[PDB]
Subunit: 80 residues, 2 copies
């Protein structure tokens, strides 16, 4: 029984930025409640001791992300 969710980081994919306190907003793959591992994107502590604003994505959904982002890359516009 759990009144809480459990998270275990399986693989680190991309670190998008790092805070003065360290807090890194990163894309990784986490397993929730020892169940199916999926893609997670949020701001974590440098020690990963805490977490915040972010979302869970399945292999299907993140698959759609890869597809459509890959399409949009036809529009070669340099991000700042």
């Amino acid at each position: 029984m759990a009144d809480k969710l459990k998270f275990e980081i399986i693989e680190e994919l991309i670190v998008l930025s790092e805070n003065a306190k360290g807090w890194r907003k990163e894309l990784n793959r986490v397993s929730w409640n020892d169940a199916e591992p999926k893609y997670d994107i949020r701001t974590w502590s440098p020690d990963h001791e805490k977490m915040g604003k972010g979302i869970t994505l399945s292999e299907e959904e993140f698959g759609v992300l890869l597809k459509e982002l890959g399409n949009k890359l036809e529009h070669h516009h340099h991000h700042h």
Copy 2:
């Protein structure tokens, strides 16, 4: 003068999936509190009246995301 943060959806990029109540986990460009629009990835209402669990991405972070995902597309991960 607003307790909550002001936001407006400038453009939609990707819809990753849709909820029973409609709530779509999508990537779209949102302008926060009348300021510079950025990339946002979260679950929104189908009417986009509300938002929830998700994160802000700038030119910097979204650019790095596109890059390193574009690398990862070397792996023929069937997302199944």
